[PDB]
Every structure is written in C-alpha cells, then in structure tokens.
A paper describes a structure:
The bacterial flagellar motor is a huge bidirectional rotary nanomachine that drives rotation of the flagellum for bacterial motility.
To obtain the C ring-containing basal body–hook complex in the CW state, we constructed the constitutively active double mutant D13K/Y106W of CheY (hereafter referred to as CheY**), which can mimic CheY-P to tightly bind to the C ring and lock the rotational direction of the motor in the CW state. The C ring-containing basal body–hook complex in the CW state was obtained by incubating the recombinant CheY** protein with the above purified basal body–hook complex in the CCW state. Further local refinement on four protomers with the symmetry-expanded particles improved the density map to a resolution of 4.4 Å. CheY** is bound into an open groove between two adjacent protomers on the surface of the middle subring of the C ring and interacts with FliGM, FliMM and the prior FliMM domain. At the interface with FliM, CheY** interacts with FliMM and the N-terminal loop and the αN helix of FliMN. The α1 helix, L2, L6, L8 and L10 loops of CheY** form an open concave surface to interact with loopα2–β3, loopα3–α4, loopβ5–α5 and α5 of FliMM. In the interactions with FliG, the L6 and L8 loops of CheY** clamp the α11 helix of FliGM. CheY** also contacts with the β2, β6 and β7 strands and the linking loopβ6–β7 of FliMM–1 of the prior protomer via its α1–β2 surface, which enhances the inter-protomer interactions in the middle subring.
Numbering used by the authors:
A (entry chain h), I (entry chain i): 1 to 129
B (entry chain p), D (entry chain o), E (entry chain 0), F (entry chain u), G (entry chain AB), H (entry chain w): 51 to 137
C (entry chain S): 5 to 16, 34 to 322
The structure:
C-alpha cells in the first residue's frame, strides 16, 4: 500500500478544481495535500521540499504543465518525483510531448474518482510503492 | 399387469342413465312444472351404465340402506356392442 | 483526441454476510419505472426541441441499482448536481446534468454552430450558464411530474444546486441502495448525458405499484369484470378441516405408541375449522344422519 | 441411540382431526349459526392422528375422567402410507 | 364486503392447463421417451385457467423476466362454459 | 391382454398443466386485466401430464403444423410420485 | 392508561429470528462442522421479531457502533400473520 | 435404524435466532419506527439454531446465490446446555 | 460473427440521415459509430485512425464519395479499409467508377434495414470477418 502520509501538490488555475482534487485525495486516504495556483507557485513550493506526488493541470498562467514538468525533471533533487497530468483536451501531440518529458500519468477532464484512483494505483505500482 | 395397475390408478366417473327419448324443442317448451315425459325404455328393463359417457354395462335399480344402487347384470362384448349399435 | 485506453496504450454460491450492505434490494424488475422513464424521456425530448430549436435524440439506459457510494464513485467531476423533492414521498432526489450537455445547450441557445466543442476546464458554471441549467431543470421536472401522473401523482420541487457529491447528503449512509436511471442525449453530432438518481427508501412504499407493468384500466368496465370474477370464484371448492384438539408430546412417546394406548387431551369447548391450516370459524361437534356434524357458532372476522 | 435421544429431546405438537370434507365457498357462505355440515368419514371410524400436520396413526375417541382422549389403534407403514395416498 | 374479506383471508391454488386431448390407454403405452402427443387446442389459443380444478377464465402465455406468466384475457362466461362441457 | 382390450374400449381425457402456484385470495382479487402471475415451475421444464386429474407423465410443448403439442419425455415414476404428493 | 402502566411495570424478552426452514432428522445427522444449511427466507428480507415466541413485527439487521441492531420496519398485521401460518 | 426411519418420515421446523436481549416494557413502548435495540450477542458470534424452539446447534450467516444461509459450526453440547438454560 | 466493437464512420451531408444510419447500426449490434459531414472531415477523422468500416454518401460538399474512396485507397494504411457507398441515384457509370475505385458495397436510397444488414453481412463474409 502507498504511504498515507505522502505529500501531494495539486496545481491548477481554478480553485474549485483544486478543492475537488483535494477532496478526492482525502476520500482515497491522503490528507497531506497542498495547492498551487500556477507553475511558478508550484515550483516555489517544490523548492521547499517534502512533496512526494504532483497533480498539475496542463494549461496554467505564466507556466504550462509541460514547462513545469520539464523544470522538475531538469532538477536532480526532483527528477524522480512523479507528476500526474490533468488536461481538458487529450491531443496526441501534447500527450507524446508530456511522455517524452517524463510524465507519470495522464488524466482527461471530466473524470471520475474511480479513474483517478486507478491512475494513482498504476503510478504507485510502477514506482514500487 | 404392471402397466394395467398403472392405468387403473386413475379415478374415473360412472354414469347410470334412466332412459332415452326423442322429442321436438316445441314439445320441450310446452313442458311446465308437473309435465309428464315418457321414456322409450320399458318399465323394469335394466338401465344403461356409462363410463365417461361410454356405455359398458347394464344394471337394475336397488335401494341400499337409504341409498339408490345399481345391480350389475350383464356387460357388452362386440356382439352386444354391435347389437346396441344396430339397436 | 485520444481516449483513456488509447492514452494508456501509448504511454505503456456461498458468500459471507456483511451487515453493512442493507440487503433490502428489489430483485424484481421495475417495469412501471421504465414506462415512466420512457414517458419522461419523450416529454423532455419535446421540451428540448422547443427550447433549443433543434431535434434531440434521448435514449433511456438500463435502470441499474447499486449502492450510493458506487453511484457517487462513477460520477464525473466537476458536474451539475440538482437536489429535488418528490412530494409526498419523503427524501431528496438528484438530477445530474453532465457538463457536456450543459455546454451543448449553451451552444445551441446562443447560436453555436456545434463545430467547436467546449472542453471542460473544471471551472464553476457562470450565472448565465446557471440560468440555462435552471431552465433545463424546470423543463425536466415538468416532464417528470407529467410522466409520474399516470401511475402516482407526484409534485417535483427543486431545492438547491451543488457541484460536488459530498454536499448532496441524500442518503443516510454511503452503503444505502439508490435507483439511478442514466439518459443519453444526442444533438446533431454532439452527445450529452444526464442522470436521475432516486434513493430506494423514497420509492420503497410504492414498491408494489412500481413492480408490475400496468396501465389502461377503467372504472365501470373494471367494476363489471371484478363483479363477474367474484361470482365465478364463489363456485370453487375448498377442503374444510376441523381439528379435534392438540396434544403436546415428544417423539419418544410416539415411538412407544401401541394399539390400545390412551392419550389424555383437554376437552375443547369449541371446535375450530381450518381451511388449508387457516381457521375460518368455531363450532360445536355433533352427529347428524349417521355422520359427524359441526354446528357453527361464530365466523372468524 | 445417542443421536436418537438427542432428536427425541425436542417438544412436538400432536393433532387429531375429526374428519375431512370438501365444499364450495358459496356453501360456506350459506352457513350460519346452527348450520349443519356433514363429514366424509363414517361415524365411529378411527380419527386421523397428525404430528405437525403429518398423518402417522389413527385413534378412537375416549373420555378420561372429564377429558377427551384418543386411543391408539393402528400406525401406518408404506402400505397404509400408499393406501391412504391412493385412498 | 364483510363476507368478502372473511373469504379473502383464505389461500387458494390456481391452475393453468396447456390443453386437453383424448387417447386410448394402448396409445399411452405406445408412448416412449421422445414420443409426440397432439392437443385438441389450436396453437396460440388462450389457455384455460382453473381454480381448484374449476375453470373460471382464459389467459395467454407470457415470459416475465425469466418466468412464465399468464395474461388474463376473458372470464369463462356461461355459454363458453357449457360449450367446453359439451366438448 | 383381454382385460387390456376391455378397458381399451373406453375413452378418457388427458390434461396438460402449464404450472402450479400458490397465492392468497386477496392477491387474486388484486388481479385485473393485464395482471401478471408467476408460476413455480422454471421456464423450459417439462409440463405435467394428467389423466382425469392424475399425474402420470411429463412432456414438452411443441407446435404441430398450426397446433400445440406435447412431446412425451418421461413417466412420472413413484419416488417422484410421493415427492410431488408431499409438495 | 392505568392498566397500560400496570403492565408497563413488567420486563419481557424480545426475540429476532434469522429465518426458518424444514429438514429431516437424517439430514440433521448428516450435518458436521462446516456444513451448510439454507433458509427459506430470501437474503435481505426483514427478519421476524418475536415477543416470548409471538411474532409481532419485522425488522432489518443493522450494526450499531460495534453491536447488531434491528431496524423496526412494519407490524405483523393479520393477513401477513395468517400467510406465515399457512406457510 | 427402524425407529430412525419411522421418525425420519416426519416434517419438523428449524429456527435460527439472531440474538437475545432483555428490556422493560416501558422501553419497548419507547420504541418507534427507526428505533435501535442492541442484542446481548457479540457481532460475528455463531447464531443459535433451534428445532421447534429447542436449541441444538450453532451456525454462521452466509448468502447463497441470493438467499440467506446458516453454516453449521458446532453442536450445542450439554455443559453449555445447562449454562444457557441458567442464563 | 463480425466484431461488435468495430468502429464505423458514417459520412453524409445530412445530419438526419447520419442519425438514421447510426440507429440502424445500433439495432444491428454496432455501437462504436462516428459521423462526418463531408469528405474533408471524414479524411481528417480517418487520419486519427481506429476505424474499421466506412459508410459514405456519394454527393457531398467539397468532396464527393468517389474522391474520398480514391483518397482512402491511395493511402497504404487505409487501402484495405472497407467502404460502403450509399447514393440517391444508381447510375451505371457511377457504379462502375466506384467499383474500379475499390468500393466494398453499394446501397441505393431509399433502403430498408434488411438491405443494409444483408450488405454488411456480404461485405464481412468477403473480408472473412
């Protein structure tokens, strides 16, 4: 089983979506969840450290999800940190670019709690958690 | 006789007919309470015994302790079968 | 636009009893509910045709019965959740509008060609979108109320709108059994869906009414039919059984019963006559015309 | 006989039936206080003895000191079992 | 209505008959596994509905969710009844 | 064989029952036109074949040229006989 | 209300029955550790509630904080009672 | 074995009790729709199995294909017999 | 039996006709049906891939059925993709041209569901499906 004290960073431009994701994570047993409004704030909070999983939106102001993922992978201290990508449009080119950047998973809005739980379980199994 | 007992294990109904006669519907309509209808059978002749409407024997009327009864007299055989057929 | 499976492909008879299951489930088919849903479907299709100036195609899905938590787990988020009341039944009903259907309706109402679908970003619905949802919900509630009239006249009243299932609180426990009826709506090349979920406890008093597939009756024709049926049944025969008394004993004493053994029994003041084990009257026993006879005293009312 | 005593240790109910008859519901509705219903069993025949509704023996009515009693006469056996089955 | 309720508190058995036919016992003995017996009723005709062996209505065969069912069509009525009797 | 022929010269009625069920009279009164009644027999099971109300065999429903038919499958057999009597 | 209070000052025992079934003693002897016995009641149906062995209501099983509980659903009523009796 | 078969040809009723508890009549009157009553038996303990009201074994609740079932676990045994009688 | 998950592309200039064809396919057991308004949109959706059968109208704006069939056959990845041609006028010259282009079948408006089912069964039998 995955560690229930794992710290999650939810990054999205909409506060309501972040609250929904936090509630879904709480229903799954994860209570250590922090929220970020854009890529810059997400990177600033990542520089603090202590996070074990990232859920980030694709299109965000001042930094999109792809650039944030590239910056995370470029950092040695956070290159192995799993990142979950949530988007509104599942274009093949964007998915391929994210996979080349090192995305751990992909979620398409709208989605159900079952899909999110399945994605989290698959990511944890791939990482051996 | 196994199949014989098998079929015997079925309840059946026996019918005794007092007599038979033929009349027109007009005469039937002329019948009221107290009307008299004659039968083709002579008084005292054995009455027809029927199983599910099939005549198989003849019998005579007796009274048993307070109940009517039929005394078996004679059965049928193709001879009587044909005989009654012709009759 | 890759589906979830395509994205994954590219990236890569004895059961224990759990008392937390509320096993009061209806294994019988709710035909009447199916007829109501079909009628509701048609009445709404019309309403949507009137509102959107386009011809909609509404398909009624299977009426799946499942616990509330499973229903909540399969609801896409974010979504438009509307709480309704089905008077005089007790409880709160849910009318679920998917964001795709809301976006399609907004497109049709505001001159959208339909060639540019709007992708759900997870944002809250705007006030104009809220008013559109309002209008759609009013039409749906009117259609539902009209559909329910033929079987049981019910008044449908809207309560409030929510965006998350946790705020609905329509069931006491997450394991409670609810009845959900999915609907698929097709408008041009755009497809939308909406769901009507009703807790089973709300419709539990109407269980028998919902069971059989009923309709087309009468008041005088049915009266004559019932009268003649009652007349016909009166000629049926029954086996009247009268019990002399009852003796409490043990099986060992039965094995020791032999010819001549006398068993003491309490003398009954009255004899109870039973039809297939059901008592019908009390009487005294006697002999008439050489046969045992019963003199009726009272009829069991 | 240990298991035998084990099962014997259970209280059971014994039922004695005066007789059986068949009638229509209309005739039942025609029954009032003082009405007379005849039974198919002849007067004096042993009455059926039932355990939890299962016929196992026959008995005769006796009066014991101020109480009704049933005198055990004869049990059953598949022969009578089948006999009453056919009966 | 009082007597209606009094008799309503009684269970009764309903019987639906597929059809009726007449044959000899010899023909019955000629029947083996896989043998075919024809019925006097035409295919599709409503089936007889009986209460304790008494015909009171007619119905049609339907399948309900995985179970056979009879759709009530019409009451017996006196004329149809007498006709079946003469049959 | 002589007695076999003697009883062979008799007509009898055969009855096929779709199924049996038990219900209360209140439920019967709740039945109207279009009402649905379930039977205790599973769909597809061979139907009971009765001679004058006596169950002697089981059969399957077939359609013969425009008429319903019963395909003889198996005799009643006596262990099953007692079992059904007990039912 | 006076008599109501007078009888209120009395303790009584309530009994909830999971289900009822009928079996032979031979089958009971065939039961060992781990044996399976089926009940006549369908899974999920409300369980019978008895006071001193007398059925007065029906209820559903719930778990209360670590303890089993029965949720009162409906009173026995006369018709359902007579139905269970005939059962 | 002869007496074993003789008593084997008898139907009996089996009763499974969810649990037992003691309460005052005042508390019973305080019970309404939705009220909660606790039982003295711990959750998960085998339920009492009774024959005609006589406790003879204990079992566990299982679901069989859509029906409740009781899994036979252990016989009553007589030391426990007296102990429960005393309870 | 043909795979019930086979993806169908219905191409017609009339939305009502496309809906009718989709409903007929659903009654036949095929639920994976997509619609195209003209040849250009049909080709664009074909470039996405995943389709196993095509039902296209003859006269469509900006691209007729014959040109769409020729383009499909000219593509190696879709040269073996069966195409069903539905028309309002069954001119012999057009039928011969479509047969030379590689048409898998031909349907003439108006038609019944039985005719469409027969054509689909014949096409599947020819392809060994």
């Amino acid at each position: 089983m995955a560690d229930k004290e794992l710290k999650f960073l939810v990054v999205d431009k909409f506060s309501t979506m972040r609250r929904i994701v936090r509630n879904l994570l709480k229903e799954l047993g994860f209570n250590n969840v922090e929220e970020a409004e854009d890529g810059v704030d997400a990177l600033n909070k990542l520089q603090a450290g202590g996070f074990g999983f990232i859920i980030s939106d694709w299109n965000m102001p001042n930094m999109d999800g792809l650039e944030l993922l590239k910056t995370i992978r470029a950092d040695s201290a956070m290159s192995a940190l799993p990142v979950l990508m949530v988007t509104a449009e599942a274009k093949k080119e964007n998915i391929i670019a994210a996979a080349q950047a090192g995305a751990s998973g992909w979620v398409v809005k709208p989605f159900t709690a079952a899909t999110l739980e399945e994605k989290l379980n698959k990511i944890f199994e791939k990482l051996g958690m | 006789m196994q199949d014989i007992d098998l079929i015997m294990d079925i309840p059946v109904k026996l019918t005794v007919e007092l007599g038979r006669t033929r009349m027109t519907i007009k005469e039937l309509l002329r019948l009221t309470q107290g009307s008299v209808v004659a039968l083709d059978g002579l008084a005292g002749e054995p009455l027809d015994i029927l199983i599910n409407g099939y005549l198989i024997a003849q019998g005579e009327v007796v009274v048993v302790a307070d109940k009517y009864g039929v005394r078996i007299t004679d059965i049928i055989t193709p001879s009587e079968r044909m005989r009654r057929l012709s009759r | 636009i890759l589906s979830q499976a395509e994205i994954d492909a590219l990236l890569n008879d004895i059961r224990p009893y759990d008392p937390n299951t509320q096993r009061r489930v209806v294994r019988e088919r709710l035909q009447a509910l199916e007829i109501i849903n079909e009628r509701f479907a048609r009445q709404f299709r019309m309403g949507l045709f009137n509102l959107l100036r386009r011809s909609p195609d509404i398909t009624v899905g299977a009426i799946r019965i499942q616990p509330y938590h499973e229903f909540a787990r399969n609801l896409p988020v974010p979504t438009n959740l509307n709480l309704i009341h089905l008077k005089p039944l007790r409880g709160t009903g849910l009318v679920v509008f998917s964001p795709s259907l809301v976006f399609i309706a907004v497109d049709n109402l505001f001159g959208g060609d339909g060639r540019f679908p709007t992708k759900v970003e997870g944002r809250e619905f705007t006030h104009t979108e809220q008013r559109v949802i309002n209008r759609m919900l009013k039409l749906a509630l009117e259609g539902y109320s009209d559909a329910w009239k033929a079987i049981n006249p019910l008044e449908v009243e809207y309560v409030r709108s929510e965006m998350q299932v946790k705020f609905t609180n329509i069931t006491t426990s997450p394991n409670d059994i609810v009845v959900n009826t999915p609907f698929h709506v097709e408008i041009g090349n755009l497809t939308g869906e909406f769901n009507i979920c009703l807790p089973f406890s709300m419709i539990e008093p109407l269980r028998e009414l919902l069971v059989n597939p009923p309709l087309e009756n009468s008041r005088h024709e049915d009266q004559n039919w019932r009268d003649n049926l009652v007349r016909q049944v009166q000629h049926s025969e029954l086996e009247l059984v009268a019990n002399f008394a009852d003796i409490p004993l043990r099986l060992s004493q039965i094995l020791k019963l032999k010819p001549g053994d006398v068993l003491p029994i309490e003398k009954p003041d009255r004899i109870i006559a039973h039809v297939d084990g059901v008592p019908v009257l009390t009487s005294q026993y006697g002999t008439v015309n050489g046969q045992y006879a019963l003199r009726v005293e009272h009829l069991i009312n």
